[PDB]
């Protein structure tokens, strides 16, 4: 009686565009219809605003300071258990189709089968250096060329990837449908991880035309000048090479437009999976989760992409639908760290077998009306950072600390667009009492000096190794998926009539 | 040597498509909008025939433009040697990039046969398992022979072995066009030739609910010619009926209607896959420079005369569609009989290859003159030496006549103009002195083209040779010959020996928009 | 179900390339340092007058494997495709329940690199595509980048590693490792009998050997050929075609070049002989020697400077004769003089392996040598063919009794009495001794015309060449798909992995057991 | 001008059998000839008396507490630099032929090329459990059936391995000899790591017959009954299932005889490698290193195999020969940790580039007569242990500590056969000053409870992941060496006569 699980994951989806399901101006009929079925979490946050740290954190349900995956090139240990391990241990068939940005020779991390390679490298190339602050590496750093180069194309590096990811995921759903009717079956858990709407902001003409009438192509907060920016936002501008880009107003609208178009481009792929689940008669016993690793500022405050804790960068959608899930909207802040314990909870796995391996909490009690009190923690220690940054999100507050930065405190009920720093300009004795309470919480959770030393050791270690691994013949760690052709379709060690019935589903119709 | 200006070629192929369903493009009752739109653009050949009504022999013949008696690929498990040049060889030698996505039923260790790249594996085996034996006439091998279980088991399903195959044949083909589109703004570009070979509408007659619903108000669910009893059937048809084990099957009338309905539905399932390729070609801005061919390897009787599947020379099993559209092709309908043997020399001709370099390697003729209104007089030849046959059968199609010979059977001759549904054997019941003179003329033609005794000897030797070899190869550890496609992941997408900004621009098309 | 294999012997076929059969009169010659091959000869039935089917790597080997003439295998040259459907002795043995394995060279051209073999331990040293295709349409031309040239003679010498030596060392090691692996199956009575083929490239040129073996022939006297260099004007038309195909015009072959070439050639024979002892010792120590038939053979010979010619591609004795020895259980030792052929190996192996001759007769052009081993007289003649480089039309040859008759439509016929003319210096076709020579010549013309239609032969070779040049030109455009064999011993299934038992693993991999 | 380096390594070579080169009674003529050329280290020790922890420590020059490779199933992370990395970074071609017991998906660890797979598994199967002390695991633990099963065989799993290891190593040397006339040649470093003389004690008859007149088939210490043994040796006896084995004296003699025979089996393979180097004319420019991971008690004290710090299990040979090495004997205790910094030193690498990555010291100064003062550290935290054990080896003393065991102090000058525990029975006023000094040294180098916590976390982490990875289809991590045949020997994209000259060496002769 254990259910199936379908995890639909996109990269770089600004959670603010999902207030109660997709925003009304978004042309996303399938994600909207899924929202009406699902328990939606309005204030869900990432664990680290970046591909590799968030995804390694997402898989294991552990903070980057515990997974040791500090940036886009830190090695992910094979020994770290993920939700793939937990479900597989409980009898689940686990599969990943798409991107998880595993760095290191391990590219499965518990997944029994991976349907595609990764769009992004798996080596120690994108290693930052805290030793040299202010330096940027042009051949892999983010720059504002994604904004000035936004436009329309029929194929891209990301669309070739997502077309492959979407097809192979639907092929696996069709394959697993053949194992229905058999009740010695293993429940399957397939993860469909798309790269859109990550930059470049380029979409196909069919979806680009859907947003001709759009008015949300202008950010809520305009471009804050550099000298009025907080130190961390300045560093992000430094790492984006702002000085060599004149981003016009049209560059901002076109980039937001193709971003919105690529969301619709994804909503068509979500509808394919739902349609496949419906025609294969697996939809009723399948949990469906929507999630994302981090967000995109999308020009707000003059910032693009991620690498900060602002709402656009730190917030990601989170929706859970399926049998036993009561639909509704939830406002208590959640974290991506809670996905792995929630997945095991829905899979009947006992809480004592997940407690010592995740730092998050199961959301199933929250779905059924039980109040959650645990705060939401966020860390970052990659590019545009010269020392680790930590962040706490509790109730209506967001606290951000960095040993080189003045602290930030935001009342998100009274200041949704975080423009007033309550740590610098407190409103009253309650703001100062809240700031002191978050300082005690932060010191109880983080040793910021050991955090910095651990990140520096990780960087200096991987560099010496990477300079060596890049001499002589290179040995790639990119995952090479193999469907054995000598065991597919018709081979002369079977029987044609027996094979045709076994590959056909539904049968007898 | 010229290089630029040569067109792209997209060969859309389907398996077991009755050519009678394509009289002037798709028949009106068929819900095939994309194929109807491609037809009116193309030079359609009304009377196109296969080379051999069987999957593997027709495909080795289609590739090389040679008769099965020349390719030695007599049945569904005869070795296709590497040295035999195919149109993939001719185009590739002329500077084309050649790619195959789908089924070609190659038997042997060579699964490319000139193709520079092959995107999928084959749906059917590549060993000597399906080898018939002329030494044992009357035998039947249940584990791979055709049987009427496809007719009694026809129906609806959302996934099948064939639908899984065609779904990834189609996707990988469109992904390759997207990939090839990135090379479009390059003047030094190699012209590409991509073959998309689908397995549908080959049986089982099982289609998705969406397409099965399209044919609820259909009237062609009953064959034009009902089931001829075994006592009144020609010797070859009875052999096909016994090789299908029709005795252990009670085909209801509803069995026929369901089989045909799913067959037409899977034609619509294919037509939607045709529109994807056309739409990919159009949006990638490659449509105007791309010749498009639609063809098939053999037909399907679909219950006509009580027969199903193929392995005979009747119109339903021997006739296949053939349409060519694109630059330099005047649309129109042609009635002179054509053959699948003509595709290879036609492809080489359309691609600027001099036919002096192709004629010593093909038995057919280029259809390019016929497109431009030139009269073609070469006859259409057909062979068969596989299951349900105890000796080779040969056929000649010329003008309005079709003559079928076998050393063990009475001769057959039909006047397809006066007798489209072949019910009057003019060899057994001539209408006058002309039919008697026509029968004599084809006997002299057949004797001039075939040594039917040496034909039977070469087939018997090829079967016995394979039975000793396949005996050993199935002992001990098996070494498979199935094609394993490999797109090296260490060289796709973003890898840290490239530049991220340069990669994104190269993998993006169209550029600058 | 499983074929009956009780009481059937193992078969170890030791093969070499370019071994002049005249160096094996009654086993290895006396002057050769070959203790292990000499010990094997005194155990074995020795066929003094064994001949190749075609003097060249690929045509002889496709013929050797199937027991069919090149005209039947269609493998005319070093680039002709070997069809997968042609049954070989690997097929025949494997059909009867044998485990078949090949370690070394067989020069298969085409996508099939096994041809019945269940396991191949190495890749091939030579290409598997249609590159080395001759063209009868351009007679007199030569292709420098793969044709034989006399640089092998002028560059003969000493080296510790070569392309061939890296290969044969890998061939010899994996052969002994496979014998070691099979020895663990040795106390199982439900085991399959094995047939392992070990094919070495030596003593194929380059004539380069290691110092250890080169020093063995410091005192040698056979460094000068029995027949000196014949001038080009006094050579037969075919020998002239071989000389120009070897680019003799731009090579000043000194006598010292001849001695160094023969010395390194003889040294590489001792190099091979030490590898023979390694195999014999592995059989002895694994306790599989007494149930294992051992066959020594070669694909063709080498002229070694005799008549001024080098390498092969001709029907003279030094190029056409190869050794053939059969040792093991049931084989009575002795020397045999009736001419035999490499075509006979395949039916012989099937006869020794208890396979009924009615299942191999329709697939071989040779006869079993087992009766000859047991004193039964053999009357079938030895047929040879050649249709490759240095030839502009196919050549054929008949070897019967004391005569050798060579015919080519472009050449004067050749007839030699090998009893009276062992070094074939008198062409009895041109200068008959009496009325018997004229009658014998006519008898061979009738034998030839009954076996070969030299017109259809020349047409088939020309079709095979032109068909490949079209395909090969295309296959060498764009991304190349290689056909070379890639051996794979899955590392995930070797040694100690964590799905087995450690103590059960050691006992199963240990042999002998209980000692 | 940088020299070649040949590292010949063996598993479980009792260091006491190599006092000043091979012992006289051992028939090792090739290793004795190499000893006369090399700097010989009489008192060299392992970092950890176990296969995988020692080699992980041997590769990186770091203690098992730093590499986190505590047992035969602990993950060796890819970011840890090894001497392969250091040499590869310095322009060396690095190759490994043989066994290194890498656990995890990385089977290269800086090695540009690996010629064979490993003889032992690479997953987390052999994982101990501190939570269940006193309970062994039958299907991979050591048992004394190796002693009762010693004998003669012509093929074993280890000999098939070492025969392949030795051949592919000599083939690589021949292959590298072709590059030997280029001035732009990369210096090569080939590591030939054999598995012998690891148990099973089974040898070929040719070598077994060499030791018929031997008088060393009896251990110097007889079997110490269980009640008189130290607690650690008692757990070793229980972890070996000693109660289910009646070990005859002939069982002891046959085990040592096959062990000594396999040393001669290795000495012949050593002579092969030297002969290959000599004939290819690379001998004069090649440094040769003989070493081992740990030793074997060989019945001494009634113990077999390793897992302890006694001389027979903790001592290993270490010899360095080649250009720029002065032959001679050395008695100051050295460690396997010193090999990686010694290799970098001999390869011209600056000491400041390996200083932060190694816990050892370069032995090159000691070779030239400079006194070495650094003590030798050893750790163990695997089977037959319920808590980590540490050990210090300085001057003439060896101190062993464990939180669950009485301390041990041995004066190896007066007590080479460690029979008198000076910690329990002191002799004079120095023996208790010395024990107090080693307690200060041990407390300064080791947090024994943090050590026990890290080992326990590693064990519980892997038991969860391995249980999952062993469900469904298994993904093997074993190394698959592949020399692509499409690029070897004669292929038709080359020139035949150009190829024969390039593959022939020496040329022109
Ligand atoms: Ca991301
Ligand atoms: Ca040869």
Author numbering:
A (entry chain F): 4 to 512
B (entry chain C): 0 to 391, 392A, 393 to 512
C (entry chain A): -2 to 512
D (entry chain G): 4 to 10, 11A, 12 to 391, 392A, 393 to 512
Which of the paper's sentences describe this entry?
The only microbial sulfatases currently assumed to be specific toward one particular substrate are the choline sulfatases (CSs). CSs enable bacteria to use choline-O-sulfate as a source of sulfur, carbon and nitrogen. Based on sequence homology analysis, S. meliloti CS (SmCS) was identified as a member of the AP superfamily and is most closely related to class I ASs. SmCS-catalyzed turnover of choline-O-sulfate in the presence of H218O showed no incorporation of the 18O label in the choline product, indicating that SmCS hydrolyzes choline-O-sulfate via S–O cleavage, thus employing a class I mechanism.
In order to understand the determinants of substrate specificity and catalytic mechanism, we crystallized SmCS and determined its three-dimensional structure by molecular replacement and refined the structure to 2.79-Å resolution. The enzyme crystallizes with eight molecules in the asymmetric unit, and analysis of the structure using the PISA server suggests that the protein is tetrameric with each of the protomers containing two oligomerization interfaces of ~ 2800 and ~ 1600 Å2. The protomer structure of SmCS shows a globular protein with an α/β fold, a central β-sheet surrounded by α-helices, characteristic to proteins in the AP superfamily, confirming that SmCS is indeed a member of this superfamily. The most noticeable structural differences between subgroups within the AP-type ASs and PMHs are in their C-termini, which differ in both length and sequence. In the case of SmCS, the C-terminal tail folds almost around the whole protomer and contains three α-helices that mediate oligomerization (for more details see below). Well-defined and continuous electron density was observed for the active site residues (Asp14, Cys54 and His297) that tetrahedrally coordinated a metal ion. This metal was thus refined as Ca2 +, because it predominated in microPIXE experiments, presumably reflecting its high concentration in the 2 × YT medium, and this was the metal ion used for modeling the crystal structure. Additional positive density was observed in the vicinity of Cys54, suggesting that the latter was partially converted into fGly during production in E. coli. Given that the exact level of fGly conversion is unknown, the structure was modeled with both cysteine and formyl glycine in this position, giving them each 50% occupancy. The active site is closed in this SmCS structure, and the loops that cover the entrance would need to move to allow the subtrate to enter and the products to leave. A hydrogen bond between Asp500 and Asn146 seems to act as a latch that stabilizes the closed conformation.
